[PDB]
Amino acid sequence: EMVKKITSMNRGDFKQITLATGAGKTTELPKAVIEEIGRHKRVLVLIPLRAAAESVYQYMRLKHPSISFNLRIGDMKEGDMATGITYASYGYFCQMPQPKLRAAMVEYSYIFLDEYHCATPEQLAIIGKIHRFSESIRVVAMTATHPIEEFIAPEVMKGEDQFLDIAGLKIPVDEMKGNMLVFVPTRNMAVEVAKKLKAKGYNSGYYPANLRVVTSQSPYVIVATNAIETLPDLDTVIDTGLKCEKRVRVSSKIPFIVTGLKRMAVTVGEQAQRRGRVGRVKPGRYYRSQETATGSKDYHYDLLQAQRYGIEDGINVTKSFREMNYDWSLYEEDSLLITQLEILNNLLISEDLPAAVKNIMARTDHPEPIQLAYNSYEVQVPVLFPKIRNGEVTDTYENYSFLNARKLGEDVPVYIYATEDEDLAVDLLGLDWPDPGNQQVVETGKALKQVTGL
């Protein structure tokens, strides 16, 4: 039925498709579109995960031997002209330079965007990069967006006397005749307060081989992280409603960009994963905490990692994102931070990147190679900041391949981009970030003070 909606479209129109019925919104809708449009025509489907693109590819070449199917999760294909439907990852087209990306994308009758709501750096790069020639393409963006009892589990006050201590959540002792699953933010608590249940008397386990031995005996009470990737006869769910995910702080004073792991609330979909862990077998329970699960995923960190894919081509990934989201209306905007990340994206690409630094990004194991690109405007040698452990300065450092870095000492560098832990060392060692020495970063700073005021 939605086929004649999709087949109304000219080159230069976009549609958002909400419906996600059956085991394949991304399987059945393009099938129906290529039935109507013809097997002589190439159709593109873009899937976040590499494995999901392969899984859907295997299933569709099996259910449908009349229609041709193609997989693109690896290396580039030059002059690629496969005539059927193509299941590809976003990372695949993220290899492509802008002439090649254009040359690839105009060759399709339709381009289907699957699970745009994940907002991975490869996703935000692609969707922003294709909107640059939005006039030449037909773009369709689709998404997904037994009894369970609701109680907001109340927070435990310090020094307080039919309840048990579960990381500051009030859950009754009577619910320890069942089988319960604890969701926690810190990668540390799932070792510690999971040990505590065993130190209280409750049979417990953390986050494969250790899981199989733990799962068999009862009562079982497990503390776990975000691993949907079901469960042996799960009775009850407890949720702290929080997670540990990356944030980006922007300031007009050095360091301009600060990033790191932070305790933030989950989304509605990410909560539905926690709400939907029990129930299917028998009517189970749900105990969340007193924080609102957000409507959208806060993507601003991934948007920063996304800027890396615009450097070689000279594309402002953040500018390209802003305009795409004005036309297509895919995501929620924090106007101020988006506006702030843009001026930094003007700094990032204001100059040609030095050939040496352009090598280091490609071959290193640094989790944030973008940090090297931002700091190259002020620093010619990367700086090893002493690692922070349990909020305190250590003697340990990060050994990252190809960095050729200088250890901090007391010499504090002029950094445009820093980490919370790097910023904390400078607080705690009793030290100060110096002022900008390069005028282009001065210019960016003046601009960021201006855009916060309004």
Please give the torsion angle defined by the CA atoms of residues 401, 403, 408 and 409, in that order, rounded to the nearest 10 degrees.
70
d(CA 387, CA 422): 8
Q: Which residue from 321, 341, 338, 339 is spatially nearest to 330, judged by alpha carbons? A: 321
Percent helix, percent strand, percent coil in the chain, to nearest 5 = 35, 20, 45
> 190, 223 in Cβ contact below 8 A?
yes
- The dihedrals phi and psi of 127, each to the nearest 5 degrees, come to -60, -35
| 34-38, long-range: CB < 8 A, 24+ apart | 34/67, 34/84, 34/85, 35/3, 35/67, 36/3, 36/4, 36/7, 37/7, 37/109, 37/110
DSSP state of 352: P
Q: Residue 141 and residue 328: Cα distance in Å, rounded?
A: 9
Which experimental approach was used here? Answer: X-ray
Question: What are residue 371's phi and psi, to 5 degrees?
Answer: -55, -40
As beta bridge partners, residue 259 has: 248, 419
Q: Both ends of the chain: CA-CA distance in Å?
A: 47
Q: How many CA atoms lie within 13 A of 95 on its CB side?
A: 13
- State the Cα–Cα distance between residues 264 and 26, nearest whole angstrom: 31
Within 365-432, where are the H helices? 370-375, 420-428
What number of helices (H) and strands (E) belong to the chain? 16, 20
Contact partners, residue 174, CB within 8 Å, separation at least 6: 162
Strands lying side by side in the sheet with 242-250: 242-250, 257-265, 417-419
